[PDB]
Amino acid sequence: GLIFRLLLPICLAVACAFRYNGLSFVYLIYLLLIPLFSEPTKATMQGHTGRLLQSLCITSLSFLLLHIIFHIVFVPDIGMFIASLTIWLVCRTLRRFASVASKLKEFIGNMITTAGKVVVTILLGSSGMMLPSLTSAVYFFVFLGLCTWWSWCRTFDPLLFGCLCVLLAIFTAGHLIGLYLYQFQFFQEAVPPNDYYWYHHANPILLLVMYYTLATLIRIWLQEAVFQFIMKQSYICALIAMMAWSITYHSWLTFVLLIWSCTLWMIRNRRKYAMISSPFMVVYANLLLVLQYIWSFELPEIKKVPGFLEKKEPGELASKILFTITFWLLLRQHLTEQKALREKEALLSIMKVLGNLVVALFIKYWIYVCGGMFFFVSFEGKIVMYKIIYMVLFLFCVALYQVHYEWWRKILKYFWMSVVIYTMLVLIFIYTYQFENFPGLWQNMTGLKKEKLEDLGLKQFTVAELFTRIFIPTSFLLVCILHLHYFHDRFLELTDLK
Ligand SMILES: *[C@@H]1O[C@H](CO)[C@@H](O)[C@H](O)[C@H]1NC(C)=O
């Protein structure tokens, strides 16, 4: 019944974790071999495997003794004793955890058998981002490829999935062999893949549990009401993550993502064009992700590009994964909806008063919100030139409204257009002033002293304050375009002299 075997994995692991010779290597081999066979039953295969393991271990102890006796630290003995005890227990076929462990095994095995694919992908991603190298690049790339394939509608038949599991299993087997076999080799650098013996001493256990889940899976394979607003928020958060990416890993590449998000904010029907441009965003995201992972290796002889992609830590990649999953979900939704529309067209071939009241209230009382946003934009932090130009525009608008009011009714939308244009220019200028040539290019082109130039807001920020310096004007632009698109013309036709 509750006749377990994982105890043998446990003791084989603790036995191979501290002794390193040709004697423990076979113990590690058999440890790797355990998760392939079933639990002990009325069977001959697992029985003979166990019995041969015990024979080999006892004989190895005997060989150690017959070596040490010739005269013309031996925890392996206790391991052999435990192995023989388990052999006898199998031949036979206060206390709180007895059934607890059984329940744990049962529910975890059922968790594997239901949706093992996604947990394998999660393990692949974790192993990839754990310790970057050329070897872990295999795991990371197959992770990324599987996630991209799932993002598309194209599915996968289980036999190819199983052969991929077999390939990855033998690959991680060889990887663990190299890892726990390296304690003899004599090298320190000129080779990326591994190192010698959580920062980097927690990877082998992750690879081991990965291989164990893969082994259970392959063993299984050989037993022959408001969710619309939620979709809206989904594409919105995908866009905002696309924007926020270009702040963490500042480079002349992700500037295209930032400018794309900016130019996508200011469009009439943004959902349609966002869904259209979704796949390109996904492919570009994962491409620059591969570039990130490559240039985040262990070795400093890569000669990072000065203005473009540069050198980063391994930890600063999970945030990029969190960004890319938004693109993946966006593409999934877009493709599903497009397929539904296509099959539909193939098949063919009490609260209103609240809405009216609130839309009228916004038509009449939103220009004041846009005006009040000027103060929040211009009166935060230090005082610089562009924050003064903002107030200059605001005061000019108010003065022109007070003076004539006939021109002010004709030159209103042009004001908002100029405002959003100026905000875009401010974004571009404050973003580009973070490279290396620019802080000197401004002087060499237009000679101004360092602080005299910095007084215009241009300075070297940190990864925190730049979020503010980008989003505050971004929020202002968003509010302004929201006013311009929906409420402007209705407001202008509301208050007029007929
Ligand atoms: C400023 O930088 C440029 C970069 O090409 C270089 O010619 C020189 O260092 C300076 N040029 C000036 C001062 O015009």
UniProtKB/Swiss-Prot annotation:
Homotrimer; the homotrimer forms a propeller-shaped Piezo channel with a cation-ion conducting pore. Heterotrimeric interaction may occur between PIEZO1 and PIEZO2. Interacts with STOM13. Interacts with TMC7; the interaction inhibits PIEZO2-conducted mechanically activated currents. Interacts with TMC1; the interaction may be part of the MET complex. Interacts with MDFIC (via C-terminus); the interaction prolongs Piezo channel inactivation. Interacts with MDFI (via C-terminus); the interaction prolongs Piezo channel inactivation. Disruption phenotype: Perinatal lethality. Pups show signs of respiratory distress, such as cyanosis and gasping and also failed to suckle and die within 24h of birth. Conditional knockout in sensory neurons and Merkel cells causes severe defects in light-touch sensation, although detection of pain (nociception) is unaffected. Conditional knockout in inner ear hair cells show no auditory and vestibular defects. Conditional knockout in sensory neurons leads to lower body weight, primarily due to a reduction in fat mas with reduced mobility and similar food intake. Belongs to the PIEZO (TC 1.A.75) family. Residues 18-23, 131-133, 249-253, 297-317, 379-384, 433-464 are extracellular. It comes from Mus musculus (Mouse). Residues 37-43, 152-157, 266-269, 404-412 are cytoplasmic. Piezo comes from the Greek 'piesi' meaning pressure. This is Piezo-type mechanosensitive ion channel component 2. Pore-forming subunit of the mechanosensitive non-specific cation Piezo channel required for rapidly adapting mechanically activated (MA) currents and has a key role in sensing touch and tactile pain. Piezo channels are homotrimeric three-blade propeller-shaped structures that utilize a cap-motion and plug-and-latch mechanism to gate their ion-conducting pathways. Expressed in sensory neurons, is essential for diverse physiological processes, including respiratory control, systemic metabolism, urinary function, and proprioception. The lineage of its organism: Eukaryota, Metazoa, Chordata, Craniata, Vertebrata. The chain holds residues 8 to 823 of 2822 of the full protein. The chain crosses the membrane at residues 6-17, 24-36, 44-69, 74-92, 115-130, 134-151, 158-180, 202-221, 227-248, 254-265, 270-296, 318-348, 365-378, 385-403, 413-432, 465-486. It is found in: Cell membrane. Expressed in bladder, colon, and lung, but less abundant in kidney or skin. Strong expression is observed in dorsal root ganglia (DRG) sensory neurons. Expressed in a wide range of cutaneous low-threshold mechanoreceptors (LTMRs), including Merkel cells and Meissner's corpuscles. Expressed in sensory neurons. Expressed in cochlear inner and outer hair cells and vestibular organ hair cells. Expressed in pulmonary neuroepithelial cell bodies. Expressed in bladder urothelium and sensory neurons of the lower urinary tract.
